[PDB]
């Protein structure tokens, strides 16, 4: 029926530019406006601007007057999306969505740019024992740390399999043009130190695979 | 030219229950208003367009109304697939700005969290790198903040915070903090906490362990 594709992820560096495509099938981008909103990690939709293809006419958000870049090829019904001099302001979800006043109103699955200056780095995981009055409790909490990687993703488990709950695996964040996250993990008190637990976690990008056995600190 | 105001940041909810969510735009947009719904990962799609016409495949429980300068989007009996993201936007005058957005979540009963903190590991301290890992699991409602001091005064450069989404199993929410040092400046503290504070205490739920005295 209807769809709008537009790109998978896309990597760039601070300082460059992009032009994003949004190419539209199942009708015609002169009939409606071609728009373009960001979103930046757990934020809101931000409407940068839109495009009458049929005119050519633009209208944007004075926040992206500077930074955006709006296009459009009815010859091939499709819209772009021009960003210049990219800041890690700019690393989002971009969707391009057509639709102006009635109940035509469809959107691409969005574009996720992430902006880095950073090329194929592999983690660095190192395990996380506990401050024992915790340890000391009912059951006690462990993890890893997987630091300074890029790009996503990384895959994380425990005891490869054995230990599928009591596991939370934090969403990674990208600082300093490098990800990291965490895996928190709960077992009984009576479970370790005495028996074993080991994460292990994998980046395919890095083609690293590491495994990481939770020992007790001198404590 | 004109903004609006979303109205709560957060609903927490029941199945069954009924709720609304409202825009004031700045300014007046003569119901040129439409109401999307954001599902965890997925894109925006059209709820309700020009204040009350319901958008295509849309069900009853759906209703738009206001006029002027207040909107209201109301879900009559909450069905499973409704919790997710809202989001308001105006199409009278460019820019066609959106609302802030609301997250509608399930709601449990309030529950503290469990919290644990994790010294830096050999592995890092040979590298050059000293991290301090808070864990601040299972909690709700989902508003928190937590705090790093060393030795007593607070710090906040260098904090990595990552929250999970609402537990699909429990409902409950989770944050990680990690305090990345040096290994200069961790030999050359003692005290290292990290002080959550959340709705369930007038004290921070606060935890740490002292370099040396191990």
């Known amino acids: 029926e209807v769809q709008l594709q537009q790109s998978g992820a896309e990597l760039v560096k601070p300082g460059a530019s992009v032009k994003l495509s949004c190419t539209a099938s199942g009708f015609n981008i002169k009939d409606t406006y071609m728009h373009w909103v960001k979103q930046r990690p757990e934020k809101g939709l931000e409407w940068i601007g839109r495009?009458?293809?049929?005119?050519?006419?633009?209208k944007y958000d004075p926040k992206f007057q500077d930074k955006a870049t709006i296009t459009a090829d009815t010859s091939s019904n499709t819209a772009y999306l021009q960003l210049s001099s990219l800041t890690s302001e700019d690393t989002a979800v971009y969707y391009c969505?057509?639709?102006?006043?009635?109940?035509?109103?469809?959107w691409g699955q969005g574009t996720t740019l992430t902006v880095s200056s950073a090329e194929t780095t592999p983690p660095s995981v190192y395990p996380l024992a506990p401050g024992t009055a915790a340890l000391k409790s009912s059951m006690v909490t462990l993890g890893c740390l997987v630091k300074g990687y890029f790009p996503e993703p990384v895959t994380v488990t425990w005891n490869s399999g054995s230990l599928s709950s009591g596991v939370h695996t934090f969403p990674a964040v990208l600082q300093s043009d490098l990800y990291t996250l965490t895996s928190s993990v709960t077992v009984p008190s009576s479970t370790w130190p005495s028996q074993t637990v080991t994460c292990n976690v994998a980046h395919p990008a890095s083609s690293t695979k590491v495994d990481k056995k939770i020992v007790p600190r001198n404590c | 030219d004109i903004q609006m105001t979303q109205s709560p940041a957060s609903l927490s909810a029941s199945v069954g229950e009924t709720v609304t969510i409202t825009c004031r735009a700045s300014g007046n947009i003569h119901n040129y208003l439409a109401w999307y719904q954001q599902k965890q990962g997925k894109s925006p799609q059209l709820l309700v367009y020009?204040?009350?016409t319901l958008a295509d495949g849309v069900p009853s429980r759906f209703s738009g109304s206001g006029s002027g300068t207040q909107y209201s989007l109301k879900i009559n009996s909450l069905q499973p697939e409704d919790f997710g993201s809202y989001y308001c936007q105006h199409f009278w005058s460019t820019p066609w700005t959106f609302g802030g957005g609301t997250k509608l979540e399930i709601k449990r009963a309030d529950a503290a969290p469990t919290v644990s903190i994790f010294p830096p590991s050999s592995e890092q301290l040979t590298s050059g790198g000293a991290s301090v890992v808070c864990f601040l699991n299972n909690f709700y409602p989902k508003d928190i903040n937590v705090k790093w001091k060393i030795d007593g005064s607070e710090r906040q450069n260098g904090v990595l915070n990552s929250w999970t989404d609402q537990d699909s199993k429990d409902s409950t929410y989770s944050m990680s903090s990690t305090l990345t040092l040096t290994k200069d400046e961790y030999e050359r503290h003692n005290s290292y906490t990290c002080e959550a504070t959340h709705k369930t205490s007038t004290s921070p739920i606060v935890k740490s362990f002292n370099r040396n005295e191990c």
């Open positions: 495009i009458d293809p049929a005119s050519g006419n633009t």
């Open positions: 020009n204040a009350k």
């Open positions: 969505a057509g639709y102006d006043y009635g109940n035509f109103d469809y």
